[PDB]
């Protein structure tokens, strides 16, 4: 049976503490639609209640302690969370937790730290003398105390910050001085060294820190009974740390712990290097495909549809790609805003959901909408495609990426899924038809478009071929009627 994950959040969900409850209540519907894993937002305390979670204040406060002005996180309390996970797991849906280990924000107090400024465009170039800054690096977790963990964070657990509370300059990155203090390596080499992203950057060279994060990772998996992770900001975290943290957590828990890293670069070579340095022990989001889809959707029909998978992880390394159309960073108004145009979204979902390559992810924003921007729910258009994935997308695949507008693939179906088999055909331009082979054994069958976009039927010829059709700027997915 086909695996499908859903990112069950968007950036602009309301701060009403009701999200875990909504997820609990949707667990049954999600399973019905063929969702098999749910990626949940950061469950811990961020820098305030309305923090999406990536502010990472206290990884041991899952909406449990009164900290940063709130007991609950944005999404709800710890018990509402456990009860969502229970409901998901009772519906046979796995839960992947987001993991933010790059930095900590929202420190309880500042420390006077000797530091040097480096060039934000080349973090290896020091551009000041050493001097003392006031850095937000002291974490004492007053509201939690030592419950679950007595680890306290101090300046020497971090490599730098971008904010001197005493001087308050923007566009500064401060590297901490101290014995053995250096930006972590290997990380992405954009800006010379991209270890520093925001807030207080965690020093992955620090043995106390490595041990703490490993232990936290076990605690988090154990406390929530997680099935895997989405690892945030991996281009900024020492690659060997991530590789080994994941191996540690899997070994400690005896669980598979499927993991997908967000390595946000539109560059297969960088992704492949990350995969090499992490020994292929986890998957990456297919950021290149995302940009291919985004660009195609903006190309008014003129994208060469035959090249849609070019340069992508899913083309090259299908077993290590999590494919996605959009996410909470690419949604409108966000940091990596590159939102696939609505008309193209169904074609994009069909590409990720009906092909045998990649582990596809459905975005909450797409499925349910983003009311704050004017993004309607596309559930009605995604549902037929999820249905295709769940019941029909099985067996040998034949691709037809051979025209600049109309492309397609078929799936021969297989014995373990009765009536499985499909032919997906799409056009970013005028409609048209394509002959495609669905399997000799399907000769004589009458197929219909499960999306309903093309009325009518197609009968498979004696040889297992048919002339499948699609409307302009549309996808049709033909399956045995
Ligand atoms: C998103 C992303 O990012 C990145 O990426 C990148 C990009 C963008 O940039 O770019 C590029 O890419 C490219 C593209 C684009 O254009 O294109 C293409 O084509 C290409 O190819 C590509 O490549 C690059 O490359 C890249 O890389 C990264 O990488 C990624 O990964 C990402 N994503 C992810 C991640 C993350 C993490 O985080 C996330 O994110 C998000 O979220 C965040 C967080 O939230 C955000 O952030 C923002 O915001 C923030 C907040 O604000 C910031 O921070 C800052 O600020 C602050 C302040 O405000 C600070 O802090 C400090 O200080 C303070 C003051 C303190 N506090 C205190 C005080 C008080 C009063 O008095 C109290 O209340 C308290 O308590 C105390 O404590 C603190 O503590 C301190 O610490 C800091 O420092 C700073 O930093 C930041 O910065 C910003 O940024 C963002 O935006 C978002 O998006 C995400 O989601 C994920 O998924
Ligand atoms: O809907 C039929 C129509 O769909 C596609 O057109 C897109 C256009 O390419 C985009 O630029 C967008 O702005 O809107 C249209 C969909 O509303 C096909 O590209 C076009 O050939 C086809 O006739
Ligand atoms: O085929 C790619 C992916 O599909 C799904 C599987 O659960 C996942 O582990 C695999 O990596
Ligand atoms: O007649 C059109 C189609 O029918 C079948 C043929 O074997 C295939 O090669 C052809 O494209
Ligand atoms: Ca370091
Ligand atoms: Ca870092
Ligand atoms: Ca085209
Ligand atoms: Na670091």
């Amino acid at each position: 049976t086909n695996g499908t994950m859903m990112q069950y959040f968007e950036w602009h969900l309301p701060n009403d503490g009701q999200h875990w409850n909504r997820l609990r209540d949707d667990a049954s519907n999600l399973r019905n639609r063929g969702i098999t894993a749910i990626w949940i937002p950061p469950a811990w305390k961020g820098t305030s209640q309305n923090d999406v979670g990536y502010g990472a204040y206290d990884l041991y406060d899952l909406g449990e302690f009164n900290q940063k002005g709130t007991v609950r996180t944005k999404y709800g309390t710890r018990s509402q969370l456990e009860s969502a996970i229970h409901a998901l797991k009772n519906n046979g849906v796995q839960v992947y937790g987001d993991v933010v280990m790059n930095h900590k924000g929202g420190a309880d107090a500042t420390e006077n730290v000797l530091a040097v400024e480096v060039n934000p465009n080349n973090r290896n170039q020091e551009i000041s003398g050493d001097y003392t800054i006031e850095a937000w690096t002291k974490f004492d977790f007053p509201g939690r105390g030592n419950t679950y963990s007595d680890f306290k964070w101090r300046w020497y657990h971090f490599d730098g910050v971008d904010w001197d509370q005493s001087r308050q300059f923007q566009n500064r990155i401060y590297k901490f001085r101290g014995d053995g203090k250096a930006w972590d390596w290997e990380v992405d080499s954009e800006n010379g060294n991209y270890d520093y992203l925001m807030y207080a950057d965690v020093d992955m060279d620090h043995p106390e820190v490595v041990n703490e994060l490993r232990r936290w990772g076990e605690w988090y998996t154990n406390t929530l009974n997680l099935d895997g992770f989405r690892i945030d900001a991996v281009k900024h975290i020492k690659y060997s740390f991530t590789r080994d943290w994941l191996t540690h957590v899997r070994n400690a828990t005896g669980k598979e712990m499927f993991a997908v890293a967000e390595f946000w670069k539109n560059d297969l070579g960088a992704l492949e290097n990350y995969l090499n340095k992490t020994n292929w022990n986890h998957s990456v989001f297919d950021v290149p495909l995302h940009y291919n889809l985004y660009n195609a959707s903006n190309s008014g029909g003129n994208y060469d549809m035959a090249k849609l998978l070019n340069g992508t992880v899913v083309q090259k390394h299908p077993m290590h790609a999590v494919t996605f159309v959009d996410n909470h960073d690419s949604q409108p108004g966000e940091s990596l805003e590159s939102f696939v145009q609505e008309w193209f979204k169904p074609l994009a979902y069909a590409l990720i959901l009906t092909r045998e390559q990649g582990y596809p992810s459905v975005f909450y924003g797409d499925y349910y909408g983003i009311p704050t921007h004017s993004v309607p729910a596309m559930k009605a258009k995604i549902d037929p495609i999820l249905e295709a994935r769940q019941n029909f997308a099985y067996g040998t695949q034949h691709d037809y990426f051979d025209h600049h507008n109309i492309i397609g693939w078929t799936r021969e179906g297989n014995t373990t899924h009765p009536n499985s088999g499909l032919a997906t055909i799409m056009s970013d331009g005028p409609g048209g038809e394509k002959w495609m082979y669905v399997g000799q054994n399907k000769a004589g069958q009458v197929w219909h478009d499960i999306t309903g976009n093309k009325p009518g039927t197609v009968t498979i010829n004696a040889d297992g071929w048919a002339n499948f059709s699609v409307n302009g700027g549309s996808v049709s997915i033909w399956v045995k009627r």
Side-chain angles (χ1 to χ4, degrees):
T1 311
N2 286 325
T4 302
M5 105 183 64
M6 176 172 184
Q7 172 180 11
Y8 205 83
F9 68 104
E10 54 112 343
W11 196 264
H12 292 282
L13 293 171
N15 172 32
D16 58 20
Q18 182 53 8
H19 194 62
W20 299 145
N21 294 340
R22 285 200 271 264
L23 170 58
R24 190 224 317 137
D25 191 47
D26 205 4
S28 180
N29 172 56
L30 295 172
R31 176 74 275 264
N32 290 157
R33 300 289 177 196
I35 303 293
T36 59
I38 279 295
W39 154 31
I40 51 153
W44 54 77
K45 197 53 59 66
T47 55
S48 64
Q49 197 188 60
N50 69 182
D51 181 0
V52 167
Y54 298 106
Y57 171 65
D58 188 2
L59 307 171
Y60 289 96
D61 179 359
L62 304 181
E64 187 176 345
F65 304 95
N66 182 359
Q67 305 198 110
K68 305 270 101 172
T70 178
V71 168
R72 70 163 177 86
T73 67
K74 189 185 172 170
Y75 306 115
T77 66
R78 169 177 170 177
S79 68
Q80 295 169 340
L81 170 64
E82 292 171 319
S83 97
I85 293 178
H86 186 227
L88 288 161
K89 266 157 180 281
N90 295 339
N91 287 268
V93 178
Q94 305 196 328
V95 172
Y96 303 155
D98 222 311
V99 168
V100 170
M101 283 181 299
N102 175 66
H103 59 259
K104 276 183 100 60
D108 301 309
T110 57
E111 305 186 79
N112 290 148
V113 183
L114 191 76
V116 62
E117 288 179 35
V118 302
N119 185 346
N121 301 322
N122 181 5
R123 282 80 164 290
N124 290 323
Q125 177 189 10
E126 307 185 4
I127 54 153
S128 79
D130 296 355
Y131 66 101
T132 293
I133 57 162
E134 215 193 335
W136 285 97
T137 49
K138 192 169 198 264
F139 294 74
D140 276 315
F141 315 114
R144 172 174 52 84
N146 292 330
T147 311
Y148 309 138
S149 167
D150 63 351
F151 196 87
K152 309 293 180 204
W153 295 76
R154 297 289 182 272
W155 72 272
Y156 56 82
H157 296 126
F158 299 107
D159 273 330
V161 288
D162 60 0
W163 190 252
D164 176 0
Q165 182 65 27
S166 74
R167 295 173 181 96
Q168 295 182 33
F169 299 133
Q170 283 192 188
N171 201 51
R172 297 307 233 273
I173 293 169
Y174 301 100
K175 192 186 65 188
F176 284 179
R177 289 311 201 194
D179 296 289
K181 274 298 168 201
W183 292 129
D184 299 331
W185 186 251
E186 172 172 4
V187 292
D188 185 60
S189 50
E190 182 177 345
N191 298 312
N193 176 303
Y194 217 162
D195 185 14
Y196 184 87
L197 188 61
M198 47 185 82
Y199 288 116
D201 192 68
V202 174
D203 187 3
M204 302 312 190
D205 294 316
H206 203 299
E208 281 171 38
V209 164
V210 168
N211 288 332
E212 172 48 31
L213 294 175
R214 279 180 188 201
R215 128 85 198 196
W216 168 80
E218 281 182 77
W219 183 87
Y220 186 59
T221 303
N222 296 339
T223 301
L224 294 188
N225 196 14
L226 289 178
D227 301 294
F229 303 118
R230 180 269 190 170
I231 309 168
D232 184 51
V234 291
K235 54 159 50 159
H236 310 292
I237 297 169
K238 188 175 175 57
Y239 294 170
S240 67
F241 167 78
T242 296
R243 181 194 57 211
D244 292 334
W245 177 86
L246 214 58
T247 293
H248 171 84
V249 174
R250 297 166 164 164
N251 290 170
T253 60
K255 289 174 157 165
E256 295 182 18
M257 293 319 287
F258 170 87
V260 50
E262 180 230 6
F263 186 118
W264 197 278
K265 204 161 175 20
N266 184 14
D267 177 342
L268 179 58
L271 289 158
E272 282 177 310
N273 171 60
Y274 174 72
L275 288 156
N276 287 328
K277 302 292 170 69
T278 53
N279 283 171
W280 299 83
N281 80 6
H282 62 279
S283 283
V284 289
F285 281 103
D286 197 339
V287 175
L289 179 52
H290 161 70
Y291 278 104
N292 283 6
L293 294 172
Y294 165 63
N295 289 315
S297 73
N298 276 284
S299 287
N302 275 343
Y303 197 84
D304 189 346
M305 290 290 279
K307 299 192 183 162
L308 200 55
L309 293 181
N310 287 357
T312 65
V313 184
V314 77
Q315 186 176 64
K316 244 263 190 146
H317 301 282
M319 290 185 286
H320 293 83
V322 168
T323 44
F324 74 99
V325 175
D326 276 302
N327 70 17
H328 59 289
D329 290 327
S330 70
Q331 72 176 87
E334 289 316 305
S335 296
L336 303 162
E337 184 194 29
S338 44
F339 199 57
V340 179
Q341 293 278 124
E342 184 175 345
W343 67 279
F344 197 80
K345 196 140 279 189
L347 288 67
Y349 274 105
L351 181 79
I352 67 156
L353 298 169
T354 63
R355 302 182 44 84
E356 58 177 15
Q357 293 86 355
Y359 181 10
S361 169
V362 174
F363 183 41
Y364 186 107
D366 283 340
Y367 194 81
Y368 282 130
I370 313 181
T372 60
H373 290 70
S374 271
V375 186
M378 299 190 67
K379 161 186 178 51
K381 269 149 194 174
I382 297 175
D383 286 340
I385 311 189
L386 279 162
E387 166 141 287
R389 171 162 192 86
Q390 176 174 223
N391 295 323
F392 299 94
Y394 289 101
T396 306
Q397 177 165 295
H398 295 283
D399 282 352
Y400 305 80
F401 280 67
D402 53 26
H403 181 268
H404 47 107
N405 293 339
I406 302 167
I407 63 165
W409 44 93
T410 64
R411 302 297 303 272
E412 289 197 27
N414 72 22
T415 54
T416 87
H417 296 78
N419 298 335
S420 62
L422 61 71
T424 295
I425 177 177
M426 64 180 44
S427 176
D428 73 331
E433 309 159 346
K434 192 186 303 292
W435 286 94
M436 293 193 286
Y437 173 70
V438 295
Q440 274 184 309
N441 58 317
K442 307 309 182 77
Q445 292 182 4
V446 175
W447 279 30
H448 70 130
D449 179 3
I450 197 173
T451 68
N453 291 329
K454 253 285 211 327
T457 65
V458 172
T459 304
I460 314 307
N461 83 4
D463 299 314
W465 293 77
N467 204 9
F468 294 99
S469 53
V470 68
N471 286 311
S474 197
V475 58
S476 278
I477 296 163
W478 298 87
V479 302
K480 181 208 256 274
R481 175 190 69 189

